[PDB]
Design an enzyme around this catalytic site. Structure first.
Site, mmCIF file in Angstrom:
data_model
loop_
_atom_site.group_PDB
_atom_site.id
_atom_site.type_symbol
_atom_site.label_atom_id
_atom_site.label_comp_id
_atom_site.label_asym_id
_atom_site.label_seq_id
_atom_site.Cartn_x
_atom_site.Cartn_y
_atom_site.Cartn_z
ATOM 1 N N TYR A 106 -30.602 -36.449 -8.731
ATOM 2 C CA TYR A 106 -29.746 -36.983 -7.689
ATOM 3 C C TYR A 106 -28.811 -38.018 -8.279
ATOM 4 C CZ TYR A 106 -28.366 -38.194 -2.912
ATOM 5 O OH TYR A 106 -27.649 -38.323 -1.744
ATOM 6 N N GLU A 131 -31.222 -30.373 2.475
ATOM 7 C CA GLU A 131 -31.869 -31.666 2.256
ATOM 8 C C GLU A 131 -32.241 -32.022 3.694
ATOM 9 O OE1 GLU A 131 -32.447 -32.672 -0.821
ATOM 10 O OE2 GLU A 131 -33.681 -34.240 0.114
ATOM 11 N N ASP A 185 -30.558 -45.748 4.668
ATOM 12 C CA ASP A 185 -29.560 -45.046 5.453
ATOM 13 C C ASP A 185 -28.579 -45.905 6.249
ATOM 14 O OD1 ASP A 185 -29.913 -42.091 5.157
ATOM 15 O OD2 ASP A 185 -31.992 -42.620 5.795
#
Ligand SMILES: Cc1ncc(COP(=O)(O)O)c(CN[C@@H](CO)C(=O)O)c1O
Ligand SMILES: Cc1ncc(COP(=O)(O)O)c(CN[C@@H](CO)C(=O)O)c1O
Ligand SMILES: O=P(O)(O)OCCNS(=O)(=O)c1ccc(OC(F)(F)F)cc1
Ligand SMILES: O=P(O)(O)OCCNS(=O)(=O)c1ccc(OC(F)(F)F)cc1
Ligand code: NA
Ligand code: NA
Lengths: 393, 257, 393, 257
Positions: free
Chosen positions: D174, D48, D59
């Site tokens: 995911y 990834e 993030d």
């Protein structure tokens, strides 16, 4: 001889050099005619409403009185253009100046708030404005000095005497004693020689008038007491005036107690001074045992007038109004408390009135009482002061 | 009392009066006492003396500093009265007038202030921030103690005021030379109303000014800032101060003859 | 699926991580129900009126347009509690937060004005307020940071990225993506993911509504154009909204031109940027040729949002509204001019709108035109900035 | 394509997949290429890879700094694509997925972005700030270029979302381990809806976490911050970095067997 009474009982008068009496008589006459002129009143009302922002709100605190039987409203002069009640009467005085054919304005200032109001009114109405400010004050009020200059006013430092408000006051009168033919002296508080105490009250009386209308609309009754700080006496007399004949309504004025009355470092001449004659009037003042005039000490720059308006001394003497004092620390605590619980930053001057209302509530939490505090101005100007203090602690 | 005698004498010598002003205690007690003795010796017909005050709002910069200097020296009103008693003990006939601000007179009681004036031998009191309109208790106390209450006849006056100044005043009528602070036909109307002799003041700083005042029909002229400027300019030269003072006075007094 | 359209033509949308979609759907639903709830509307109106000071004045300039055929009015959001228009919608959003049962508030701020409004509303309504501010901004906005803290809000510096508004924006969304269950994100402009552009417009629309009522009362007709600065787009869309269907009324938005569009140092993405996708929306933005997001440069700290609300991009695209830019120097001149000729100190943001109205007047002095400039805030906060600049010149 | 082959192989070896994440160019081009080769050699079943972006709002701090470091090195998207082509030329079968932010994909055209992905040999693209609700043009362009569009199945989801993620996604689903940013029964419903194999991500930093994910029915686990932390902690030790990376990976990969 005058058209109106220059005295409130033993207090007041026109103690100025003979040379200045014609200017006061002219001003009194212009004021009396203006008060009867619908055209003047319409112009003044238009400026107050569309330029200054009147009426100002009457805000009910919803957090600060929790757990008690006190209902507290704040009359929001902090929302007036300029950030304080000062703007009301400078608009009236500026119009009086023009009615007399005067083209120049002289003002005195200590904290700079009245100086800023004078400058903004002068810029709007086309008057050449010169402001006298004690050099000690100019030094600590760089922001307001710059605002005044941005608005086109000439700012003049006064180094004579203690280089503070009283010396600025003297200088304004010295100037006026030689230029009254073309200039008007826009005194900033309800003090000084007649007709000023009267003119300033009448041009600030909409505070109390609006407050009465607003509280009747919201509570259906008059307040138990209206509370206001007292430096020279203008915001307080503006709130008090319309309630003087409502005998059930308490009128409470709060002078600065500084470091404490017993320290001698305060600004509470009405209750702890002695009657004297200065600044054109007979009134209580901060003075030495010899009779020399002294300064008023307060953490708040605006409660610096070393005397007090004659109508307040008179209302005290007959028992119609009661006066008390609040210390620097009590004012600081009220300042912090309103910021945190109501989201309003009060001027440190106004914080003295709020502190006394807080004391009335806290001392007798189960006493049912409807109180109004005149929030004379916003305290953005005091942020650094409060910051350094707390940081120092 | 002393003013009447002085004016009668001066009239007999067809001369005008020259009256200097100084702040008491400026720049100190001793030097002030010497300055005053010099002024008298140089020809001063009378004296105008200021008692140091915190807020002299009728005075220009020169006299404002006169007050500052006196304060720097610690001069108090009580000490001024001690100076006054001594000056009178030294000079029995010279008229002495005080220039006061209202609070110093009202402080411990108006009547008491004029009684103290009488006790030390002062002749008149001019309260700068008390207009005729507020003068009643001051002029009444002055008269009870044989002190002349001095009134200001401004240039921008009128008949009403003229009649009041004439009936209320004593000693001399203070004829203001102009508007502002310290730095003609009125005279006749004053005589018309039997007013106390007129003394012109404000801006008088040259001999010709003294001659012109007396010619206009004034009984004399008062000069202060011009006198105080000689003091401030010679602070470091005590002796030269007296000499220059002596020079100016004699010149001014000469113009009155 | 949503209750309302998330797009204004091609602009807008909900470009946020999947995890945050439930929070946006919840917020949209709460808003739609609130808009139909008379009790919510009454509460919001009460706060606006009695706490914030609405309605604000509509001031006719009487000096600045002399010698021309322009009649200029200023909508006085500078008189609103807090000192800027920001206060209007934070009161609405704070009430929405409470309707959803949320007890905490997250806000982002650049100049600090929205941060201060968020903190004051949070203090009044009992919400725990945390504000994210780029560390570069915290450094230059010590005053507002202190006001926020005096009002009980937690101020959190963001050192990531450029340490400015966009990074503060990212941090607020990062926080929200993990605390939405208990906290509401009180975004400060008409941008970001739907429903914010819509909610912010609806909670600022009283500016234009009042302006329309006031101008009809005073002039008996609608303005020829209403003018407002555009950072993110809230004060402008608040003024514009009620006039969108009055086709004769021009809508003019003014982006900051900084040192000049040709220097690349500006904040005018609507007219000189390129459409991109960031901060939850598809809209014009300040970006590198690679697609990295850049900062908006302006002498005014509040015109720093590097993009613009999607409804403005849409109104521009269809020709309903026109957008222009004003440089730092033109804004500075308008600031000086209003202080001196009208006695009003404008925020430097608002000064951009005033500068363009001054240009419309000066360029064609004999064109008859009735203009309204939204005075989004007062400029007391900018005094030092203007001072140092002029002093440096 | 590569994901299907990988999952079929792993299923045959009854093992889960271990997929590490790193930011391309962190802390530099060369060292990043070496880090990536080490991860593969240590057991990574797929990769990834993040393309440095100015505003990575999904993030946590660890990866935010990963981006900062890459920017400090001057890493651009064009250079990332050169790195990608080279990594593919070196490793023909390992699945490579990109972690993107919407603006980098939309910038020069969505279709053009996925076409470039196909050209260099990328297998999937996850656009972090594009929810299923805004995904149409992205998933359509992805499919036109044989790229798997990766969708996020949050923990706080529902049937509607589950059905969409299952029909729209490809490569792997995911599966978010939690709410927040980078630093169970869903799995069954996904299988029920024939969704792409589930890969759990967010907070995966230990071997037991990998074993637990595979046991819950996930096809494998993704780990990023834990990997990026080894990079940041050994910046001054290039070689030790690779060694520690090698250690963590092998451990994590072992847990998948
Ligand atoms: C907000 C506020 N509230 C109260 C006061 C006190 O004056 P007041 O007693 O006349 O109302 C002042 C005075 N300010 C005077 C004296 O320094 C000035 O020159 O600005 C003020 O600025
Ligand atoms: C007075 C005033 N006028 C205009 C603007 C511009 O924003 P708007 O376009 O949303 O109206 C701002 C913005 N202020 C934002 C962005 O920095 C803040 O966080 O305080 C302002 O403070
Ligand atoms: O020569 P100048 O210009 O300094 O004038 C002399 C000053 N000293 S004085 O006692 O006459 C004097 C007398 C009265 C004064 O004020 C008043 F007029 F308002 F009453 C001021 C000064
Ligand atoms: O181990 P962690 O916690 O650092 O997680 C790995 C992070 N790298 S990643 O490509 O999976 C990744 C994938 C999607 C992300 O955002 C989104 F969910 F909103 F779409 C963020 C990171
Ligand atoms: Na006082
Ligand atoms: Na912008």
């Amino acid at each position: 001889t005058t058209l109106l009474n220059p005295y409130f009982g033993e207090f007041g008068g026109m103690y100025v050099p003979q040379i200045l009496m014609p200017a006061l008589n002219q001003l009194e006459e212009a004021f009396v005619s203006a008060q009867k002129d619908p055209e003047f009143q319409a112009q003044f009302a238009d400026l107050l409403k569309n330029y200054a922002g009147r009426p100002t709100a009457l805000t009910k605190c919803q957090n600060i009185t929790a757990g008690t039987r006190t209902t507290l409203y704040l009359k929001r002069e902090d929302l007036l253009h300029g950030g304080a009640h000062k703007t009301n009467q400078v608009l009236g005085q500026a119009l009086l100046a023009k009615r007399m054919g005067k083209s120049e304005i002289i003002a005195e200032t200590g904290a700079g708030q009245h100086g800023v109001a004078s400058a903004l009114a002068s810029a709007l109405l086309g008057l050449k404005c010169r402001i006298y400010m004690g050099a000690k004050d100019v030094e600590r009020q760089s922001p307001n000095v710059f605002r005044m200059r941005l608005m086109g006013a000439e700012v003049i430092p006064v180094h004579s005497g203690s280089a503070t408000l009283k010396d600025a006051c003297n200088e304004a009168l010295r100037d006026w004693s030689g230029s009254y033919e073309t200039a008007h002296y826009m005194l900033g508080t309800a003090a000084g020689p007649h007709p000023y105490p009267t003119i300033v009250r009448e041009f600030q009386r909409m505070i109390g008038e609006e407050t009465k209308a607003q509280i009747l609309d919201k509570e259906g009754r008059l307040p138990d007491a209206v509370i206001a700080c007292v430096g020279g006496g203008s915001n307080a007399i503006g709130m008090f005036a319309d309630f003087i004949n409502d005998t059930s309504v308490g009128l409470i004025g709060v002078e600065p107690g500084g470091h404490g009355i017993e320290t001698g470092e305060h600004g509470a001449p009405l209750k702890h001074g002695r009657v004297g004659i200065y600044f054109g009037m007979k009134a209580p003042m901060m003075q030495t045992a010899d009779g020399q005039i002294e300064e008023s000490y307060s953490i708040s720059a605006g409660l610096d007038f070393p005397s007090v308006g004659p109508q307040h001394a008179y209302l005290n003497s007959i028992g119609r109004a009661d006066y008390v004092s609040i210390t620097d620390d009590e004012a600081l605590e009220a300042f912090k408390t309103l910021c945190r619980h109501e989201g309003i930053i009060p001027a440190l001057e106004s914080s003295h009135a709020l502190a006394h209302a807080l004391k009335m509530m806290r001392e007798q939490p189960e006493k049912e009482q409807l109180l109004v505090v005149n929030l004379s101005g916003r305290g953005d100007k005091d942020i650094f002061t409060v910051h350094d203090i707390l940081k120092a602690r | 009392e002393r003013y009447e005698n002085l004016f009668a004498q001066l009239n007999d010598r067809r001369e005008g009066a020259f009256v200097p002003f100084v702040t008491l205690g400026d720049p100190g007690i001793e030097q002030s006492l010497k300055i005053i003795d010099t002024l008298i010796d140089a020809g001063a017909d009378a004296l105008e003396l200021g008692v140091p005050f915190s807020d002299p709002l009728a005075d220009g910069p020169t006299i404002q500093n006169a007050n500052l200097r006196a304060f720097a020296a610690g001069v108090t009103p009580a000490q001024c009265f001690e100076m006054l008693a001594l000056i009178r003990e030294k000079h029995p006939t010279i008229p002495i007038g005080l220039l006061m601000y209202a609070n110093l007179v009202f402080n411990n009681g108006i009547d008491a202030f004029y009684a103290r004036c009488e006790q030390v031998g002062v002749d008149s009191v001019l309260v700068a921030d008390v207009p005729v309109e507020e003068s009643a208790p001051f002029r009444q106390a002055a008269l009870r103690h044989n002190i002349a209450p001095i009134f200001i006849c401004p240039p921008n006056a009128d008949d009403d005021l003229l009649r009041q100044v004439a009936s209320y005043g004593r000693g001399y009528t203070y004829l203001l030379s102009r508007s502002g602070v310290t730095g003609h036909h009125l005279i006749e109307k004053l005589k018309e109303y039997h007013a106390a002799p007129a003394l012109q003041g404000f801006g008088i700083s040259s001999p010709e000014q003294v001659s012109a005042a007396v010619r206009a029909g004034a009984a004399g002229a008062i000069s202060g800032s011009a006198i105080v400027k000689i003091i401030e300019k010679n602070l470091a030269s005590p002796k030269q101060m007296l000499a220059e003072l002596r020079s100016f006075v004699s010149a001014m007094k000469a113009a009155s003859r």
